[model samples]
Target: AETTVKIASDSSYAPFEFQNGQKKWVGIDVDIMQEVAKINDWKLEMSYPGFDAALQNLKAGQVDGIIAGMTITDERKETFDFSNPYYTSALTIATTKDSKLSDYSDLKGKAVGAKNGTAAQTWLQENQKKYGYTIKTYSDGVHMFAALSSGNIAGAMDEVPVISYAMKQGQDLAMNFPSISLPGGYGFAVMKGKNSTLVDGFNKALAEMKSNGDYDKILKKYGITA
Candidate 1:
């Protein structure tokens, strides 16, 4: 009998994990998880409950693991165990295509948007006083990008790959400032001390995929270099 693992993911983080026109989950994360499951002989069962919900579900033991482009951080490590880092991402500010905001200083007294419960949100909240920018949080990237395009916010801060993917899909956003490297890379995670075997299997399969070029194929399919 195959091990059946329940995996949770964000529903709208395009190019990472999102529903297609046919409403099928397809993206780099989906592909990677599927490949890893195949390698480990696990039966993959996935759910798209958004990022925050996925985290909550994992903590509540409603899911076995999560692969939602979640960054591995010391704070998160307290509640979750993570697989080896799979992808590195940087956070950057994005504004409407016609906007002239060129730097963080330009955001003073302006409203900036970030998806709630994300690294971008935390970073913005931490630096809000220094930048003199007010934050507007959205539940997902789609809503946040919409607010930016509609001029409800002067800028949106998000991961580079995420924003670039949105632009490629015609979101009409521009990133003019340099990106800040996040402290860690994305990882698959499970509740701390609850799923060590699964994490080990994930790391082992990930290493195999990386060595055999399956990893590059998946990223290339999504137009992402890392």
Candidate 2:
């Protein structure tokens, strides 16, 4: 029926939403939403959007939803509506095997790296003293990973997908422990009170994907299955 929905996310985020060799927009987020649109019998006006401008576009009714690496939290509920968690992943503090950062405890008096203003960054900031760490903010994950690779920072604290991608690229990184995933999970968020109908419809479509195994298939394809 061609509802032509607008959803925003970073197209440069490899394995999530990025350009393939054929110059096509292909990634986990793209595939999942494509399935959602097909199952719901609608069409999308998708774009690789700027993350910083996302909330503005969403709140101004320019975008119907956001499907980046957005996490679902109680504080966000006051501003937008989120479907049940579509995916969940833990954090991975990546460092060279030779680095002194052995674990979260070693983060104290050390510069913990993250993309500024991201949920991972918030986690680092909130738990600075609790986790005994000091934040070393970057404009994005790639830069932070580079810093960790070059011995510029103690470690790079980031979501699993990003860290996994870096490690697969042969960045010589490893997690401190077996798992660092966050509790709860990720979801598509919409402007509060403005798109409840679409939200309800999407919830049904999401469940159908789970039941059909299409959801897990794509995650496996991306090496992010869980």
Candidate 3:
């Protein structure tokens, strides 16, 4: 008999988790969880309630775990147990295709966008004084990108892969100053001190997936490297 684990992701992040035109969830995070559960002989159920909501659900035990492109940081580690870091990413600034803002110096006194509660948002807050820019935040990537496209913001802070994949999906944007922003790794997280069985099983299965090349295959399917 296989155990069923319910996991949630931010449905708005492309290539990591999002619904297609058919409203079906399809992305790297979904594929990774599916493969890991299969290899571990477990049944996986999925959900999406936005990133912050998913975090709340995990803490409240409404879900067993979460895989929402969340970074494994020191603060998060204090409240949650994360599996091995699955993917590394760099936070980046994206500007509209027609915008000439290619560097930090060009952003003086301008408005930049960021999804609420993300590292990018926090970083922007920390450095806005130095950059001399104002900040605007959204609940998800879709809206933030929309603000970027419409010129409501000069540029938006986000993960490089998310910005790249959005371009691949027809979003007219380019990363501005790719050299900036902190580097971090994504992870699957569960409530602290709980779900030890699930965490251990997932870590074991993830190691196997990486060893057998299934992890690379999933990344390749999404046109992502590392």
Candidate 2 global CA lDDT score: 0.77
Per-model TM-score on C-alpha atoms: 0.77, 0.79, 0.78
Model 2 over residues 20-129: C-alpha lDDT tens digits?
Answer: 78999987778888887777777877777666577778887788998876778889999988988887878767788776567677776777788987777887877787
The TM-score of candidate 1 is 0.77
lDDT string for model 3 (90-184, tens) is 87788888887888888898999999988899989999888899999999987998888788998999877787777776679776585453545
Q: How many residue-pair clashes does candidate 1 contain?
A: 0
lDDT values for all models? 0.89, 0.77, 0.84
lDDT of 1 by residue, 149-184 (tens): 789999999988887777767679788978999978
Predicted structure with the largest lDDT when compared to the true one: 1
Question: Could you tell me how far off, in angstroms, the CA of residue 112 lies in candidate 3 after the best superposition?
Answer: 3.1
lDDT of 1 at 138: 99
- Give the distance in Å from residue 20's predicted Cα in candidate 2 to where it truly belongs: 3.0
Once superposed on the true structure, which residue ranges of model 1 sit more than 4 Å away at CA?
Answer: 50-63, 97-100, 106-111, 116-118, 132-143, 150-153
